[PDB]
Amino acid sequence: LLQDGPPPGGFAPVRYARRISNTGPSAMAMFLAVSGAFAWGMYQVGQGNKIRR
Amino acid sequence: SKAAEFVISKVDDLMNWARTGSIWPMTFGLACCAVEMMHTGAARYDLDRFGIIFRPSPRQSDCMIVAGTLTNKMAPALRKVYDQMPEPRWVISMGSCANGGGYYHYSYSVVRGCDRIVPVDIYVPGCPPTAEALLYGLLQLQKKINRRKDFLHWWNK
Amino acid sequence: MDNQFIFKYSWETLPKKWVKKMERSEHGNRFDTNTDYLFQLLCFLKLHTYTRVQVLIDICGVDYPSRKRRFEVVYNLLSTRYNSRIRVQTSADEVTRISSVVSLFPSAGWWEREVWDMFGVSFINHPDLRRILTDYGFEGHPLRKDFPLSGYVQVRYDDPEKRVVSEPIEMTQEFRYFDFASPWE
Amino acid sequence: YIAVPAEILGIILPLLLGVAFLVLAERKVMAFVQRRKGPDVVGSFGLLQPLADGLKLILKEPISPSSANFFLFRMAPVATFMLSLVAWAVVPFDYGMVLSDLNIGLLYLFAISSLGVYGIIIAGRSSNSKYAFLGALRSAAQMVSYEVSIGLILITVLICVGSCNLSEIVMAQKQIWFGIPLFPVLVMFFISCLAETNRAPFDLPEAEAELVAGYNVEYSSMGFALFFLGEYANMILMSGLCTLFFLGGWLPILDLPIFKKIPGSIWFSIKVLFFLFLYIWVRAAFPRYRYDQLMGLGWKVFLPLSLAWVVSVSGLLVTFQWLP
Amino acid sequence: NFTLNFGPQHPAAHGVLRLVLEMNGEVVERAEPHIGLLHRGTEKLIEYKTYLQALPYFDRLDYVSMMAQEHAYSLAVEKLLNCEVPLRAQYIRVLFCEITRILNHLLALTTHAMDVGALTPFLWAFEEREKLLEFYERVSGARMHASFIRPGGVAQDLPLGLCRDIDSFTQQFASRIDELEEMLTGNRIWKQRLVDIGTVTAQQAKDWGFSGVMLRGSGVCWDLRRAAPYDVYDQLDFDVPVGTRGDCYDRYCIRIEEMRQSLRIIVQCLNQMPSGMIKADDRKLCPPSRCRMKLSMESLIHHFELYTEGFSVPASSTYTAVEAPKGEFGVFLVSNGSNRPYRCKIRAPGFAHSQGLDFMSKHHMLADVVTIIGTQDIVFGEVDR
Amino acid sequence: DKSEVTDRVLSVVKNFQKVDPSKVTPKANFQNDLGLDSLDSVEVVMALEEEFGFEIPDNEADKIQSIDLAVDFIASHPQ
Amino acid sequence: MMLEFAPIFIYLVISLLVSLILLGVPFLFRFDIRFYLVSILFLIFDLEVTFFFPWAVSLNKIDLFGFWSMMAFLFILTIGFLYEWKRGALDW
Amino acid sequence: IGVPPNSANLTEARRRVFDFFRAACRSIPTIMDIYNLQDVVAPSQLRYAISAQIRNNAHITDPKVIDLLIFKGMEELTDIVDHAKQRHHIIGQYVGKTDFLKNFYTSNYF
Amino acid sequence: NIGATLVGVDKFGNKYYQKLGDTQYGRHRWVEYASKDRYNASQVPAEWHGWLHFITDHTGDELLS
Amino acid sequence: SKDWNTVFERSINTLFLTEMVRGLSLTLKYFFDPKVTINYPFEKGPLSPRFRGEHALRRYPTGEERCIACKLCEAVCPAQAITIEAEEREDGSRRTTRYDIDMTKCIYCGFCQEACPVDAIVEGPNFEFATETHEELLYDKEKLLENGDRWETEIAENLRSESLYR
Ligand SMILES: CCCCCCCCCCCCCCCCCCCC(=O)O[C@H](COC(=O)CCCCCCCCCCCCCC)COP(=O)(O)OCCN
Ligand SMILES: CCCCCCCCCCCC(=O)SCCNC(=O)CCNC(=O)[C@H](O)C(C)(C)COP(=O)(O)O
Ligand code: SF4
Ligand code: SF4
Ligand code: SF4
């Protein structure tokens, strides 16, 4: 007389549709963050080589 | 003999501690009991906590767990696997099919337990044994290892 | 596409002398042929447009140790696009070669060997017919009603020679057969 | 002059203990990723577990098949362990904390790295197993293939520095670390070192019982232990090299605050720890490469790209006369 | 072309799998799996035990979709008996079959991934599978092998505090699926190790009898629980994922979508759960209540004659078929009219999948064979009966 | 030549426990003169191919019913 | 100069002794061709690296002539490597 | 190759029996080479053993039964030749007052 | 070792603790064995066995009545 | 087909391992989260009142053993583990003189538990009974009765609790 079952009104809705987020770094800006860093770093390496010389 | 007894007792204690703190069982899973055996090593029970890392080959493993039924065709393979292991060779008969007959125990192509071959040290009963049951069986095996006076016997002889 | 339509069609379309007998029931539609017009019947049922039976589910086997044709192999079929099931069966014999159907359905290659292994009904024009389930040195066919449940040979390890050797069966506790059969039924 | 073996022992024993504890470190930090704890019952937090493993391997008398050759099957782990340990004689820690101050240090490291291929070739053949021999041969081929990428990246580093001395390279990074300008070269070097030591997504030796089973499938406790020790020492060595070339070996991060006056021997240590953490992270982050695409990748993605990086760095330095 | 002997003795390749194959050095020509190492002998042992004693045989076969296996036997016995089962039992049977489907898909996905090399999602998914094995522990006596489903209805009623826990699990199971999927679908290595591997055409799948995910991975919309719905599935709303290319990647996507649909069906069954009795009442094939057989004479007689003799199925024969997680699982019962089955052949979906390995590994790499084994989800309990 | 190999193919025939050296000739039929069975004949053929490298193919193994034919075939063989 | 190799030799000897005693302690208690091609490719590029080493170190002394004389060598062997690429010696 | 259809008459089965015996004799060096048995037994009396086993069942007249024995013999031969049968089994199968008093002394059931 | 409260004692001396979470399992209730020599791996009595495994909400002291 | 603006993004993404650092960062989110494993010797996993473990022969509160040798359990056991021998005592009532269970054959299916008309045999919640010898697993009558006596205070409570079912 006490069968287990859903509560009066039913359970809450649930999502199952593979929610997609976006936590990626960037799209194109990483190319600049690499290239400008490369140029400035090579300049710094040149200055270091001059000091060592 | 009493003067040189403390040293041999300490050596026995050290060897027993070393052998109990790192057992490398070989997953010789055969049937549904292999599911529970790999399920013990999951994130909930963490079989690795006791230094129970598994091994892929019988050359390095010092223990093996016979999880699952043992048919007639796999009996020679089981014997060959057991032979290749190094000297200690502790064997655990997980499940109810491996530790004597089993739920079949009567069909033509079934070995009535893994005790006709590969002599067993610990019998773990269940179909399939609960993960805690396998953990208790491993603890019992560790307790068995602690009773080995390896150096005392070789020094008395 | 349902049971009755297929029954009418295969009663009309099928050439005679192929189906020895047929049944129509809710359990399943049967086409019992005469162990020789099997390849032809399956080929017709596979290629015909109104009966596009494409997949062979399994090849069964029943041992009746009371009829002259002892064995009875059963071919379960299924038509995917018509969504219908046809169960064709024959009558075999312990010393007789029944034709194989590997050419039509390649999946039958292993059920063929399994039926050979369990019962002993050999087949013609089959590439292998090697034992697939029992031991390499196994003797006899186990699913026959003659074969004892415990079997004929046991397996154990003996120390005089370091290998696993077979031996005559000798059980500690015999299989207790409980005879629950009662009258009034 | 009798104190040289004291230095040698002070190098060897801590390094062997470091390998032993690195095993525990990976087995714990990989378990924490998978909602586990790892070995936490033997010692305080498993800190005694490596000792237990070592003692268990000391015991459990070896099986010693030695079917084909008594010598080579027994000498190969010795050779690979010697090669793993010997390259530490030139790595500088802070300033004078280096065993040998070679002027050809990079060439010596290159020779040692390329010379470890035999340890998995003679060992592979010595075991009478087709699955062991063929897998060991393929692993040797992979290491040999990535050796050239390692060498080309070393040339890229050497162009900026101007000398083969290892201790001089770190002093060349006073202005900035080499990870800033040529970061993609650092990434390529790290991936190649992953492939060189058979670790993370290239470790087909531990591919269970596939086409590759491993060169150490049939080895006793101690031979397998020696191979394991040697290749984890190689892992530590390559992490140290990667953090010594493209990162300051002992130099502070940016020496702006005042607390960066701490000894430089620990900067090297924390950087090596960071790279070891990346090693283990990559291992328990990605699946494996099949051997066919691993070879194609190593020959068509890392050789031309490292060659292009060599050419670009050399041209840029020559054009602006930013040469040492 | 030299020949090497596979056959590892560990569950890191599912165990019990000889698989002798031909090698040109890097490309496999013909692979011959040697099944039979797990031929326990159930099919012979079925005929010696009554219709109730033979139920636990079906849990052992395909021992990861336990309640999806005895369900076929129960349906076959019901069809042979003209037994009508109450609605609540049908709903809970559907719910537990969906739980079996989820368990099988999780285990198959993670075992296949660990075969590839990805070992971290393995423990995550077994952490999530703990929660469902606990549900199995609750309703039945045992975690894994649960003889919950009987020919009449189910063995025992659900505990009071079960549906709340099941819904609480389903609240976060979708997020767990997303977490497991983000590590593999979007990954680069996973794509190059699966795409264009083991491609099967629809004609090949039909010819080789690949009913299941392999059939649906070739573009064939053949779902047995929608084409031939047995329990209350018409009321339930779900979709049938169908692949485009027969490679291993689309089978993986299909399995993920199948897990999604199983979660949806579990939610629907939890919502639409009627009251009433669980065991049948038309025929006498159900035990009397233990609070009833102790004060009634006819009830005690029925209890005695059912737990010794069992119910006698009238003489007939049939082939049932349910949608097991592996594929189509069917039981071919032949009844002699007595209380023991005359012949009970078990159509294992993994048998055909394993035989169809020879043409799938045609001109592939050797390490390309373990992924083909993983993608077809073979357990050797069902293959060797 | 035939004489060199006859002295050796006569020796192997003595091990069949049915053939008496008092009833053997260079012209001696196995089935008729020696009374050998057809199975005994094929065992004799089997003993012949073990004498040397040749296998005595199936097609030509049924035209050596007489000992002289077998001797001629063995002598006139490359192997 | 060469006095920095004596510590290396002694270190090698001590490492050999330790490795020997490590395994001395427990006693107290079918043909393929791609491999050969990739090995030759490694040999060629190993010679490339061997030639690269003197060039990179002595690069400030020689400017715009040594660089181009090395780029010509790189171009020749890049043509060779491209020929290896198309002839199916890199993919399997 | 594929399984031939059953023989129509006994003379067609007789050539099949001879062909099976021929193949068994052709393959007999392989067993002696891959199972490492030279001092225990010589190849010549293996011929006698095979002939005895093939002549014991010589009274069967039915062509179908003879064909089935040939089939089973071929399966056994392929099992032995291939690495299926295991050592000390081929040699196991191959290579007073009165009987009543012995049988009485050993057991009741003889 | 430490937790929210302490739930009863045992004739064998081991003490049973109990912690309460909010929504996730883990660190609910455990046992601190009185002894330390391998603790026999099984020392809980029949009354406290049910409470430890969440079989019953009875403490075990209440299970005696 | 490409527009010189999408090929740039696709080439860059395949060159900077963005889809790999995505998973790399994903794997790290559980590193600092609380763990899930349990200290088994101290805290054990949650069971259910219906758990089927080591068998036990319970007896009446008066002291008489509850088994009446009806042999329903022996006749319903699918594994054929139970062997029973009965005899009329000099008291007059029927009882068991030899009731043993082969724990190696037993599969813990609970058929024997639900076949008793008097609830003589039950499966206790004890899942830790691994032994060292095979002959010890053959549970005779005395060992099984001792098991029933040991777990009576909890077996009876388990039976009373889930008595609303079955
Ligand atoms: C804080 C210190 C941290 C130190 C460590 C740094 C972080 C390391 C983290 C490593 C994590 C990832 C490790 C994964 C291991 C395996 C990854 C290999 C993947 C791979 O090889 O794919 C290749 C592409 O990637 C590649 O090619 C890789 C090389 C990319 C180099 C970048 C070159 C860009 C040049 C831009 C120059 C800019 C300046 C110009 C003036 C080929 O791709 P595929 O074969 O799979 O697909 C079809 C292409 N045909
Ligand atoms: C190591 C090798 C492994 C395999 C070894 C072999 C194992 C299986 C052996 C086969 C066992 C059998 O019985 S299978 C073979 C049994 N079949 C027969 O014996 C045919 C009946 N006999 C006749 O036809 C004639 O009497 C005949 C005697 C032939 C000649 O006499 P004729 O010329 O007047 O015809
Ligand atoms: S004990 Fe049970 S679960 Fe384990 S192999 Fe035997 S039947 Fe399967
Ligand atoms: S069913 Fe219960 S009462 Fe009957 S014989 Fe078995 S244990 Fe005794
Ligand atoms: S649990 Fe099942 S197998 Fe075990 S004794 Fe009871 S009825 Fe028999």
E126: its two tokens = 């077994």
C77 - beta bridge partners?
C56, C86
Tokens 């061709």, residue located: G33
The CA distances from residue G47 to D152, G51, G58, J13, J54, in Å, are 11, 6, 18, 34, 72
Tokens 């883990």, residue located: I26
For D172, the 3-state DSSP assignment is: coil
Element (H, E) at E178: helix E163-182
- Of all atoms in ligand 4, which is nearest to the CA of residue J118? 3
Burial pattern E89-102, b for ≥16 Cβ within 10 A else e, equals bbbbbbbbbbbbbb
Ranges of H-type helices in chain D = 4-33, 49-58, 72-86, 105-115, 122-126, 130-161, 166-171, 183-196, 221-245, 265-283, 291-300, 303-320
The 3-state secondary structure of chain G reads CHHHCHHHHHHHHHHHHHHHHHHHHHHHCCCCCHHHHHHHHHHHHHHHHHHHHHHHHCCCCCCCCHHHHHHHHHHHHHHHHHHHHHCCCCCC
The shortest C-alpha distance from J130 to chain E (Å) reads 18
Q: Please give the Cα distance from D154 to G54 (Å, whole number).
A: 13
Closest CA to B38 of E15, E8, E184, E349: E15
Q: Please give the Cα distance from D199 to D186 (Å, whole number).
A: 17
* Chain-chain contact of E157 with A11 (C-beta, under 8 angstroms): no
Q: Do the Cβ atoms of E34 and E20 come closer than 8 Å?
A: yes
How does strand E317-319 pair with strand E328-335? antiparallel
Closest CA to B123 of B143, B155, B98, B153: B98
Tokens 């900026």, residue located: D160
List all residues 6 or more positions away from B78 whose beta carbon is below 8 Å from its beta carbon: B28, B66, B70, B114, B117, B118, E9
Q: Please give the Cα distance from E357 to I63 (Å, whole number).
A: 58
Q: Do the Cβ atoms of D161 and D237 come closer than 8 Å?
A: no
Ranges of H-type helices in chain B = 5-21, 32-40, 75-84, 131-145, 150-156
Closest CA to C168 of C132, C136, C139: C139
B142: its two tokens = 């560790």
Q: Please give the Cα distance from H31 to H36 (Å, whole number).
A: 8
Query: For residue I24, which phi and psi values (nearest 5 degrees)?
Result: -120, 145
D104: its two tokens = 């050809």
Using a CB–CB cut-off of 8 Å, the residues of C that contact B are 133-136, 138, 142, 147-152, 154-157, 162-164, 175
Q: Please give the Cα distance from D15 to H86 (Å, whole number).
A: 50
Which amino acids of F are annotated catalytic?
37
The number of CA neighbours under 13 Å toward the Cβ of B129 is: 34
Q: Please give the Cα distance from D99 to E67 (Å, whole number).
A: 67
Residue-wise DSSP of E265-283: HHHHHHHS---S-SS--SS
Resolution given for this structure, in angstroms: 3.5
Residue at J128: amino acid letter: E
List all residues 6 or more positions away from E63 whose beta carbon is below 8 Å from its beta carbon: B31, B32, B35, E144, E145, E379, E381
Q: Do the Cβ atoms of E335 and E315 come closer than 8 Å?
A: yes
Q: Which of H1, H3, H60, H78 to mutate to test the interface with C (most CBs of C within 10 A)?
A: H3
Closest CA to C39 of C8, C12, C63, C75: C75
Ranges of H-type helices in chain C = 3-12, 38-47, 108-118
Residue-wise DSSP of chain H: -PPPPPPSSHHHHHHHHHHHHHHHHHTHHHHHHHTT-SSS--HHHHHHHHHHHHHHT-----HHHHHHHHHHHHHHHHHHHTTTS-TTSHHHH-----HHHHHHHH-S--
B55 - beta bridge partners?
B26
D168: its two tokens = 């001089």
Burial pattern E125-146, b for ≥16 Cβ within 10 A else e, equals bbbbbbbbbbbbbbbbbbbbbb
Q: Please give the Cα distance from D54 to D225 (Å, whole number).
A: 9
Chains sharing 3 or more CB pairs under 8 A with chain G: D, E
The CA distances from residue E36 to C110, E40, E381, in Å, are 12, 9, 10
* Residues of E in Cβ contact (< 8 Å) with B130: 143
Residues 33-72 of G with CB under 8 A from D: 34-35, 38-39, 41-42, 45-46, 48-49, 52-53, 56-57, 59-60, 63-64, 67, 70-71
The rounded Å distance from CA C62 to ligand 3 centre is 28
Q: Please give the Cα distance from E128 to E120 (Å, whole number).
A: 13
Residue-wise DSSP of B97-112: TTSSS-SSSSSTT--S
Instruction: Out of B30, B127, B130, B134, give the residue to mutate to test ligand 3, the one with the largest number of ligand atoms within 8 Å of its CB.
Output: B127
Peptide bond into J49 cis (omega under 30): no
CA angle centred on B75, ends E358 and B19, rounded to 5°? 110
Q: Do the Cβ atoms of C89 and C23 come closer than 8 Å?
A: no
* Chain-chain contact of J164 with A28 (C-beta, under 8 angstroms): no
CA angle centred on H38, ends H37 and H40, rounded to 5°? 75
Q: Identify how the structure was determined.
A: cryo-EM
* Chain-chain contact of J43 with I27 (C-beta, under 8 angstroms): yes
The number of CA neighbours under 13 Å toward the Cβ of I44 is: 26
Q: Please give the Cα distance from E19 to A4 (Å, whole number).
A: 49
Q: Please give the Cα distance from C78 to C90 (Å, whole number).
A: 17
Q: Please give the Cα distance from I54 to E7 (Å, whole number).
A: 43
* Number of Cβ atoms within 10 Å of the Cβ of D36: 25
A and C interact (at least 3 Cβ pairs within 8 A): no
The 3-state secondary structure of chain J reads CCCCCHHHHHHHHHHHCHHHHHHHHHCCCCCCCCCCCCCCCCCCCCCCCCCCCCEEECECCCCCECCCCCCHHHHHCCCCCEEEEEEECCCCCEEEEEEEEECCCCCCCCHHHHHCCCCCEEECCCCCCCECCHHHHEECHHHHHHHHHHCHHHHHHHHHHCCCCC
Q: Please give the Cα distance from E368 to E192 (Å, whole number).
A: 11
CA angle centred on E73, ends E71 and E74, rounded to 5°? 65
How does strand B90-93 pair with strand B122-123? parallel
Q: Which ligand is nearest to the CA of D272?
A: 1
Tokens 């076949």, residue located: J115
J50: its two tokens = 């219906």
Q: Do the Cβ atoms of F45 and F61 come closer than 8 Å?
A: yes
Q: Do the Cβ atoms of E79 and E98 come closer than 8 Å?
A: no
Residue-wise DSSP of E327-377: BEEEEEEEE-SSSSEEEEEEE-HHHHHHHTHHHHTTTEESHHHHHHHHHHT
Q: Please give the Cα distance from H31 to H37 (Å, whole number).
A: 9
Query: For residue J89, which phi and psi values (nearest 5 degrees)?
Result: -70, 165
Residue-wise DSSP of B23-36: --EEEEE-SHHHHH
Residues 27-66 of J with CB under 8 A from D: 27-28, 30-31, 33, 35-37
Q: Do the Cβ atoms of E231 and E95 come closer than 8 Å?
A: no
How does strand E3-5 pair with strand E20-23? antiparallel
Q: Do the Cβ atoms of E217 and E360 come closer than 8 Å?
A: no
List all residues 6 or more positions away from E101 whose beta carbon is below 8 Å from its beta carbon: E65, E68, E258, E259, E262, E325
List all residues 6 or more positions away from E67 whose beta carbon is below 8 Å from its beta carbon: E93, E96, E97, E99, E100, E136, E146, E148, E149
Closest CA to B22 of B88, B119, B84, B67: B88
Burial pattern J84-119, b for ≥16 Cβ within 10 A else e, equals bebeeeeeeeeebeebbbbbbbbbbbbbbbbbbeeb
D297: its two tokens = 């990748």
Q: Please give the Cα distance from E273 to E95 (Å, whole number).
A: 10
Closest CA to B127 of E15, J99, J53, J73: J53
Ranges of H-type helices in A1-53 = 29-52
H23: its two tokens = 């193949």
List all residues 6 or more positions away from J24 whose beta carbon is below 8 Å from its beta carbon: D281, D282, D285, D286
* Number of Cβ atoms within 10 Å of the Cβ of D157: 22
A3: its two tokens = 């069968």
Which domains does chain E show, CATH number per domain?
Answer: 3-376 (1.10.645.10)
Q: Please give the Cα distance from B50 to G1 (Å, whole number).
A: 53
How does strand E317-319 pair with strand I29-32? unpaired
Burial of residue G71, with CB atoms counted within 10 A of its CB: 0-12 exposed, 13-18 middle, 19 or more buried? middle
Q: Do the Cβ atoms of E110 and E129 come closer than 8 Å?
A: no
The CA distances from residue E262 to E75, E94, E173, in Å, are 20, 10, 11
For residue F35, the enclosing domain spans 1-79
Residue-wise DSSP of D106-140: HHHHHHHHHHTTGGGTHHHHHS--HHHHHHHHHHH
Q: Please give the Cα distance from D35 to D31 (Å, whole number).
A: 7
Q: Please give the Cα distance from E286 to D150 (Å, whole number).
A: 74
The CA distances from residue J76 to B97, C33, J85, J114, in Å, are 20, 41, 16, 10
Instruction: Write down the domain spans for chain H.
Output: 1-110
Q: Please give the Cα distance from B152 to D110 (Å, whole number).
A: 51
Query: For residue H12, which phi and psi values (nearest 5 degrees)?
Result: -75, -30
The shortest C-alpha distance from J128 to chain E (Å) reads 15
Closest CA to E239 of E223, E218, E250: E223
Q: How far is Cα of residue E360 from the mean position of the Cα atoms in its chain?
A: 23
CATH class of G5-87: mainly alpha
C30 - beta bridge partners?
C23, C87
Q: Do the Cβ atoms of J53 and J64 come closer than 8 Å?
A: no
Q: Please give the Cα distance from B63 to E169 (Å, whole number).
A: 38
Q: Please give the Cα distance from F11 to E382 (Å, whole number).
A: 60
Q: Which ligand is nearest to the CA of J112?
A: 5
Instruction: Write down the domain spans for chain G.
Output: 5-87
Tokens 């019913």, residue located: F65
Sign for the pseudo-dihedral over CA of E227, E228, E231, E232: positive
Ranges of H-type helices in D162-254 = 166-171, 183-196, 221-245
Q: In what order do the strands lie in the sheet with J82-88?
A: J82-88, J94-102, J138-139
List all residues 6 or more positions away from A10 whose beta carbon is below 8 Å from its beta carbon: E271
The shortest C-alpha distance from D287 to chain E (Å) reads 4
For B127, the 3-state DSSP assignment is: coil
The DSSP letter of residue B72 is S
Q: Please give the Cα distance from E94 to E265 (Å, whole number).
A: 8
Q: Please give the Cα distance from I9 to I60 (Å, whole number).
A: 9
E4 - beta bridge partners?
E21
Q: Please give the Cα distance from D57 to B19 (Å, whole number).
A: 9
Compute the CA torsion angle J117, J120, J124, J129 (nearest 10 deg).
-130
Q: How many CB pairs under 8 A join A and D?
A: 53
For D216, the 3-state DSSP assignment is: coil
Angle in degrees, 0-180, between the axes of helices D130-161 and D303-320, rounded to the nearest 10: 10
Q: Please give the Cα distance from B38 to E125 (Å, whole number).
A: 13
The CA distances from residue A19 to C129, E174, E241, G43, in Å, are 53, 9, 18, 51
Query: Beta-strand (E) ranges in chain C?
Result: 19-23, 30-33, 55-59, 62-63, 71-72, 74-79, 84-89, 153-158, 163-168
Using a CB–CB cut-off of 8 Å, the residues of B that contact E are 26-32, 34-39, 42-44, 56, 58, 68-69, 71, 73-74, 77-78, 81, 103-104, 106-110, 127-128, 130
F49: its two tokens = 């191919």
* Furthest CA-CA distance within chain D: 65
Angle in degrees, 0-180, between the axes of helices E87-116 and E248-271, rounded to the nearest 10: 150
* Residues of B in Cβ contact (< 8 Å) with J38: 44-45
